[PDB]
PDB file of C-alpha atoms and ligand atoms in Angstrom:
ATOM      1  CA  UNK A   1      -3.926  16.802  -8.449  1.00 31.98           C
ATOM      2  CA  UNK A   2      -3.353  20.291  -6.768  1.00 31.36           C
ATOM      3  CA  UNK A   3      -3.855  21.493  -3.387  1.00 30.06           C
ATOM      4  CA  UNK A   4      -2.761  22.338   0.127  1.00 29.76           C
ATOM      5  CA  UNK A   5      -2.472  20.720   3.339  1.00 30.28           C
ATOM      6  CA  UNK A   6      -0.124  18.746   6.052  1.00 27.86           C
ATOM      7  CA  UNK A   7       0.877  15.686   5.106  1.00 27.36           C
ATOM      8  CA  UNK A   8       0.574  13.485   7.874  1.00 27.72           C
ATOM      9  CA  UNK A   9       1.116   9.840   8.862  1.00 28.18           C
ATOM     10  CA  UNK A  10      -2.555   7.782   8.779  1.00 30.47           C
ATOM     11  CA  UNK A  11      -3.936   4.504  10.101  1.00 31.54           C
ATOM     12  CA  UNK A  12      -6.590   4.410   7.506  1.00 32.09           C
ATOM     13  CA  UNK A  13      -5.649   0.393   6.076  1.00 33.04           C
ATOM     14  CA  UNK A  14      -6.306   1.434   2.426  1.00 31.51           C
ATOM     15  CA  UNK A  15      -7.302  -1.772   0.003  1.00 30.37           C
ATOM     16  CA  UNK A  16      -4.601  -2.189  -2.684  1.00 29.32           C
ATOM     17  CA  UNK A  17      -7.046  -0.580  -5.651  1.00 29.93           C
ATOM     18  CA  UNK A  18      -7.599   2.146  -3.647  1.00 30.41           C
ATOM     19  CA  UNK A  19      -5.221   5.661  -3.967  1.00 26.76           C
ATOM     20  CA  UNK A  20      -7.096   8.389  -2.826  1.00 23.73           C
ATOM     21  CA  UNK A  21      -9.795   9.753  -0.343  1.00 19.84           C
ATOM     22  CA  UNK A  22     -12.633  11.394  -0.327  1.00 18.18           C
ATOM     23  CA  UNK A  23     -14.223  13.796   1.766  1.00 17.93           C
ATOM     24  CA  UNK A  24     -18.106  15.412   1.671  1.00 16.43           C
ATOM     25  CA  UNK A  25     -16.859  18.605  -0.620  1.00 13.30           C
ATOM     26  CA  UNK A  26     -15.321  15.786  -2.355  1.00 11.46           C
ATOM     27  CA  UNK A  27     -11.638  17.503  -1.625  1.00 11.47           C
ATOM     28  CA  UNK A  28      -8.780  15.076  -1.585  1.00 11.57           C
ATOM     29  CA  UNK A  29      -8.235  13.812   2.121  1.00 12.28           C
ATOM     30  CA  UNK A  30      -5.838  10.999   2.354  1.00 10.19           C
ATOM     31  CA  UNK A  31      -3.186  10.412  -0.994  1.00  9.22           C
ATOM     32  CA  UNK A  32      -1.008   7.280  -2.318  1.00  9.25           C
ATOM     33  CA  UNK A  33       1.867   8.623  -3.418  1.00  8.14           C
ATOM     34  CA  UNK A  34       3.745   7.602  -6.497  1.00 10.09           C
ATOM     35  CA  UNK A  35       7.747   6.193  -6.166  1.00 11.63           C
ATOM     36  CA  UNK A  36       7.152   4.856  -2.928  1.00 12.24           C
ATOM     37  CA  UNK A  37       3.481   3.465  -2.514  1.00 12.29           C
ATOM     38  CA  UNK A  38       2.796   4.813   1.002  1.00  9.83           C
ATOM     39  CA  UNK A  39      -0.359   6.334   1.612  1.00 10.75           C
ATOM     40  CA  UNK A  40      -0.454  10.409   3.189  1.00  7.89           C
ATOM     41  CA  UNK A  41      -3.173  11.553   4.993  1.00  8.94           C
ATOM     42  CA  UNK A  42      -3.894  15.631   4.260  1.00  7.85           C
ATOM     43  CA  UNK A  43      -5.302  17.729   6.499  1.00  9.65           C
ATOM     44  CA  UNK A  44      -5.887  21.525   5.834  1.00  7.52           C
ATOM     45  CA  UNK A  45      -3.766  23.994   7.402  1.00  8.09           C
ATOM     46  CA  UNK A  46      -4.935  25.541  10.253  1.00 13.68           C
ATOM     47  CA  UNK A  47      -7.071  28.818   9.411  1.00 15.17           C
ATOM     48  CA  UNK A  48      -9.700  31.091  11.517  1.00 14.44           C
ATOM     49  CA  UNK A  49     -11.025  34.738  12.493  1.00 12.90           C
ATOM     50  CA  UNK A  50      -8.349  37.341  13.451  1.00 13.63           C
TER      51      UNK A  50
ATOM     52  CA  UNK B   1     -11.395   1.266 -21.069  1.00 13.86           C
ATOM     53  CA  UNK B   2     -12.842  -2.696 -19.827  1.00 11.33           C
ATOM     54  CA  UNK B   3     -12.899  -2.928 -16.026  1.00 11.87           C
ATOM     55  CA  UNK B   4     -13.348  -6.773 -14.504  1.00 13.52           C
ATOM     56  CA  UNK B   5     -13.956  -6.811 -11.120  1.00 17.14           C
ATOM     57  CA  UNK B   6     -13.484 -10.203  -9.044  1.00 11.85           C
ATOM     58  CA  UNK B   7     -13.958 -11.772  -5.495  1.00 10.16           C
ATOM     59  CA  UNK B   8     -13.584 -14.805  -4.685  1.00  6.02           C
ATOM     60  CA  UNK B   9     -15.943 -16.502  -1.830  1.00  5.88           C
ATOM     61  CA  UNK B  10     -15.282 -19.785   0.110  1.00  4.06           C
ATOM     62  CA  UNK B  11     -18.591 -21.461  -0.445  1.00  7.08           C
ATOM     63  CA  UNK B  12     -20.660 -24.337   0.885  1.00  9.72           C
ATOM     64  CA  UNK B  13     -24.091 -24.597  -0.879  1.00 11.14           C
ATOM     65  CA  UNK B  14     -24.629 -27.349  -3.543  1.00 10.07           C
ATOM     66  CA  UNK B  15     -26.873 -26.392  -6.161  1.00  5.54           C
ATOM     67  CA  UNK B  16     -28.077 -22.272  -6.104  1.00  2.95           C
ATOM     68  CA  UNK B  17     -26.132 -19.190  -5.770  1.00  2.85           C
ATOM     69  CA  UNK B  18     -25.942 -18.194  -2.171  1.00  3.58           C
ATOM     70  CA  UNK B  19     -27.332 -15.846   0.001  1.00  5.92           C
ATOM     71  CA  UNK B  20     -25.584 -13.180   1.254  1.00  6.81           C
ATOM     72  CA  UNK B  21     -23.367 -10.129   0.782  1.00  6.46           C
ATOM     73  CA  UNK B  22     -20.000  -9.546  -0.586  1.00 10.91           C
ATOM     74  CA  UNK B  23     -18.708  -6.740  -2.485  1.00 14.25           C
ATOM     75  CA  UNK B  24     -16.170  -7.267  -5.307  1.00 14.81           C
ATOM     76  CA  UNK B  25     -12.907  -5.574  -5.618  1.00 15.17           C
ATOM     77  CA  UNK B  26     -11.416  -3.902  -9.110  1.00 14.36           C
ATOM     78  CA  UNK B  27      -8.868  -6.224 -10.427  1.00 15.32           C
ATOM     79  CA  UNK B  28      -7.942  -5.395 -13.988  1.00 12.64           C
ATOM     80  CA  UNK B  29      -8.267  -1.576 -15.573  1.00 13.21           C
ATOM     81  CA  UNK B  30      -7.643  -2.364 -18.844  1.00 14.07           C
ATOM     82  CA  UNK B  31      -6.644   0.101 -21.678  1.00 15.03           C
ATOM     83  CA  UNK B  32      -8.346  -1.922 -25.034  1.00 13.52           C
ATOM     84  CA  UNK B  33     -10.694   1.093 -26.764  1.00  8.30           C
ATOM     85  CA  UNK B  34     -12.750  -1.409 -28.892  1.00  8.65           C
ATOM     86  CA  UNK B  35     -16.150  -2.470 -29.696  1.00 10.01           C
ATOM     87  CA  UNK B  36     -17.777  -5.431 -27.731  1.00 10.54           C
ATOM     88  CA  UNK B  37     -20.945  -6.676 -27.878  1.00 12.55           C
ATOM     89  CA  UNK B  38     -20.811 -10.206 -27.757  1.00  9.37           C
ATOM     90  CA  UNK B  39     -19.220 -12.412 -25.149  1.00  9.95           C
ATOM     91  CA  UNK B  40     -18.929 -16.433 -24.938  1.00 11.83           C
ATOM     92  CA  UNK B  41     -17.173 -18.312 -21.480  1.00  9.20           C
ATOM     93  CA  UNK B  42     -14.495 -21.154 -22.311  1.00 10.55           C
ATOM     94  CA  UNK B  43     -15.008 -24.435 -20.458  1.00 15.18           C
ATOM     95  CA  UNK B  44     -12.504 -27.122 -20.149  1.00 20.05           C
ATOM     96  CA  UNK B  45     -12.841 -30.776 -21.532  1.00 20.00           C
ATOM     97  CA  UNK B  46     -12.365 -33.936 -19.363  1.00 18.71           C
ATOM     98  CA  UNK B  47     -10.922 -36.953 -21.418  1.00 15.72           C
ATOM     99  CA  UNK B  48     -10.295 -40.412 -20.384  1.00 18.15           C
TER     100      UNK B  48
HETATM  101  C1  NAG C   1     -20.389  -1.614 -32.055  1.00 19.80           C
HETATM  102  O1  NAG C   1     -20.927  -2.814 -32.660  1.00 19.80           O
HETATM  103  C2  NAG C   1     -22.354  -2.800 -32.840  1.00 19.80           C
HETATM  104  C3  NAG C   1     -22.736  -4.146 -33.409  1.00 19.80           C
HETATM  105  O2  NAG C   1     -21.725  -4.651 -34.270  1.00 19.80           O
HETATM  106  C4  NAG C   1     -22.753  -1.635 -33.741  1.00 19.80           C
HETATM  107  O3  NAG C   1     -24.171  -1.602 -33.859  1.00 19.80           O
HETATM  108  C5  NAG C   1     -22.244  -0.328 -33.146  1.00 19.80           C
HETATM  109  O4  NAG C   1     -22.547   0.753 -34.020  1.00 19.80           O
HETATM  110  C6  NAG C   1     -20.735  -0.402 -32.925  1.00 19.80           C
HETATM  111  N1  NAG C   1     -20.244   0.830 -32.327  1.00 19.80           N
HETATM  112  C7  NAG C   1     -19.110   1.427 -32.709  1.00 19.80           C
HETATM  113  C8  NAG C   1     -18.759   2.693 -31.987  1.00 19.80           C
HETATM  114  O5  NAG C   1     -18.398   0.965 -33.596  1.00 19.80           O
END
């Protein structure tokens, strides 16, 4: 799974099946990672109109 | 791939399947890749 964001400490209790999250554009929000279990929340980087 | 879901519910009713709502969680993804069509549940036998 590809993409970019901040990786961010969540408080989003996550059921042990669940991994990922899932936005409306269906774009990855929150992540388990692999190793160590923990669950990431991503946000995308901050963007807007020079 | 065969996916069993389970819950289990702390129950009070005697005879009919309650009433109610609960939503079963994914227990076992299972990697088989084979044919089923036919199923049949295992009891257990009470001897005295
Ligand atoms: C699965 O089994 C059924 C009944 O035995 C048969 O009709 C069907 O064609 C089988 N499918 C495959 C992919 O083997």
């Amino acid at each position: 799974l590809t993409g970019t964001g901040v990786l961010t400490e969540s408080n989003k209790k996550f059921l042990p099946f669940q991994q990922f999250g899932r936005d409306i554009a269906d774009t990855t929000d929150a992540v388990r990672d692999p190793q160590t279990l923990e669950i990431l929340d991503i946000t995308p980087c901050s963007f807007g109109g020079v | 791939y065969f996916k069993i879901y389970s819950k289990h519910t702390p129950i009070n009713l005697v005879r009919d399947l309650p009433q109610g709502f609960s939503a079963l969680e994914p227990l076992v993804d299972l990697p088989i890749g084979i044919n089923i069509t036919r199923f049949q549940t295992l009891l257990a036998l009470h001897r005295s």
